[PDB]
Design a protein around this ligand. Structure first.
Ligand SMILES: N[C@@H](Cn1oc(=O)[nH]c1=O)C(=O)O
Ligand SMILES: N[C@@H](Cn1oc(=O)[nH]c1=O)C(=O)O
Ligand SMILES: [Zn+2]
Ligand SMILES: [Zn+2]
Lengths: 258, 258
């Protein structure tokens, strides 16, 4: 009866409240996805418990052991009933879990330290003074790994072999590295996170260029789960009432610091 | 074995080729959705026949007779196996048919005759010299009808009662009316169609402001159809190969006239 909602600590989707160490259960967290889980549960009519994913990952399949990790894994092996998180809808994931229709649209983008002389992936690709990388595992990394498009192949060729590693274990790590690199590191990440970060102090980063692709985040459910249908209707409803747009303004722009 | 693909004459999704009167079957048409149906059928491995929807509509339910019209209707009453068209994913539709994940993202937008003094829905709403309207039936009209947001309620209040009607039976009609109105008519339509039109001669229209919402088009299938699953994977695949982006450039921007 109390359903497990797997999620992931990633601002501003899910965040520790300032006095969290003194709080319990759901009250520990706030963010866009905390609000969204609340709204969804209200329409689906369920009680639920947020659970930050143990391995801190999104979800990829180990090519060796065939095993799925991250939030995906939590749904594939039955430890969670639903994932409300910035989980990217992809072909490989969609073969093993279900996704609602997108609650947010987005694409991969480039984050630079202000002043950095880079406007496009082409600008990054044709040079080697400025390093660049992506979250160590996630759909962004995969986009590069799988692309057949020359510029992206070049970038992947460089990233996969660069030393030290240019991959990071979290978004926050990538951002820190951009901020600390005096313009000598650019980070490849989703436009959503990129835009959030751009609106926060010290206001020293910016998104440059267009997005590289066009995709979305879906609320995810175990394959053939009988919550799937309701959750999907619930998402469309919420989008149609303009609630999704309201929550986006609330967590990104309303409090923007820049 | 030969499956019926319902679609709709709407540039540049589906269009008569210049020598169509001399051609037969699928060869009569070209466009983004003609290309997309081709790609999908190739991955799903089916033979198919495009069929322009008889009533020229997208799909709404007659509140009186409960009957569904347009492409939706063609799927609900079994006359078509799939719809490959700029069909907007909505809550009411999703209750009666299935949609793949979005193949294109978009939102409602404002089309003006260049020079018209309007930058936002708020600008339209607060005045009455410039008339404005939407496709006579479609999700855009419905957005206005259902909104609880003050500005949109105002607009709907004005549109529903305006004389002569401000609704049009086709996109093309709305565009013509903007072009013929010397700036005294603005048209509410999806950003996709708006952008296409902006790139065509006489180059006298433009999109102004942000979109009013954020949604997408899905390939649609009869509810519980066993083509649904393949079509959905097929869409994600195509997006992941960058084919969807390539077709968008092909039909909108590559040949842009402005
Ligand atoms: N939403 C992404 C995770 N991730 O966040 C980014 O910004 N890049 C990236 O790969 C996923 O679902 O894998
Ligand atoms: N895609 C829309 C049809 N339509 O096209 C527009 O530009 N507005 C509008 O309502 C639908 O599926 O109802
Ligand atoms: Zn703490
Ligand atoms: Zn003709």
């Amino acid at each position: 009866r109390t359903i497990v909602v797997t999620t992931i600590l990633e601002s501003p989707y899910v965040m520790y409240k300032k006095n969290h160490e003194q709080l319990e259960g759901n009250e520990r967290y706030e963010g866009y996805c905390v609000d969204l889980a609340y709204e969804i549960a209200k329409h689906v009519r369920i009680k639920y418990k947020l659970s930050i994913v143990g391995d801190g990952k999104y979800g990829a399949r180990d090519p060796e052991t065939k095993i799925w990790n991250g939030m995906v894994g939590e749904l594939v092996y039955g430890r969670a009933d639903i994932a409300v998180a910035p989980l990217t809808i992809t072909l490989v994931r969609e073969e093993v879990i279900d996704f609602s229709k997108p609650f947010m649209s987005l694409g991969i983008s480039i984050m630079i330290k202000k002043g950095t002389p880079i406007e496009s992936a082409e600008d990054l690709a044709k040079q080697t003074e400025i390093a660049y990388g992506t979250l160590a595992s996630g759909s962004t990394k995969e986009f590069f790994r799988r692309s057949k498009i020359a510029v992206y192949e070049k970038m992947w060729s460089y990233m996969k072999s660069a030393e030290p590693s240019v991959f990071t274990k979290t978004t926050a790590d990538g951002v820190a590295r951009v901020r600390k690199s005096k313009g000598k590191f650019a980070f490849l990440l989703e436009s959503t996170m990129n835009e959030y970060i751009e609106q926060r102090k010290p206001c020293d980063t910016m998104k440059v260029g267009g997005n590289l692709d066009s995709k979305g985040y879906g609320v995810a459910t175990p394959k053939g789960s009988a919550l799937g249908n309701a959750v999907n209707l619930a998402v469309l409803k919420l989008n149609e009432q303009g609630l999704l747009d309201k929550l986006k303004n609330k967590w990104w722009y309303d409090k923007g610091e820049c």
